[PDB]
Design a protein around this ligand. Structure first.
Ligand code: NA
Length: 129
């Protein structure tokens, strides 16, 4: 599923991401835009052989099991394919654990390089939220 901007904002708000650990909703929509272009089916391989999955590009090195990342962890206790679903529940619940791990949203390289320090509230402008 490719989400609309306000559609994703509304679903993220309903799942409790607005101001989660102090990050306003615009931060999460900005992160999703530059991580996956709002596409739940996005995948990208990393140099170490791990793979990033879903709308927030969650990494199999630490967070999910894809059966092809030996020696890795599965801290969200999910198969990585669950992160590709049109239902974003698993992605959001895993993201909540990531952002709580001490580095905040700096865990997402696209957020640090393209969202941090910008007017992130622009990403929810116009939405009925
Ligand atoms: Na893993």
């Amino acid at each position: 599923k490719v989400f609309g901007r306000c559609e994703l904002a509304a679903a993220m708000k309903r799942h409790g991401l607005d101001n989660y650990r102090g990050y306003s909703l615009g931060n999460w929509v900005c992160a999703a835009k530059f991580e996956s272009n709002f596409n739940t089916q996005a995948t990208n391989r990393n140099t170490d052989g791990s793979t990033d999955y879903g709308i927030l590009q969650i990494n199999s090195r630490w967070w999910c099991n894809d059966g092809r990342t030996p020696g890795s962890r599965n801290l969200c206790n999910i198969p990585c394919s669950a992160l590709l679903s049109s239902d974003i529940t698993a992605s959001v619940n895993c993201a909540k654990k990531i952002v709580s791990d001490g580095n905040g949203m700096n865990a997402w390289v696209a957020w640090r390089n393209r969202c941090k320090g910008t007017d992130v509230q622009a990403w929810i402008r116009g939405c009925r939220l």
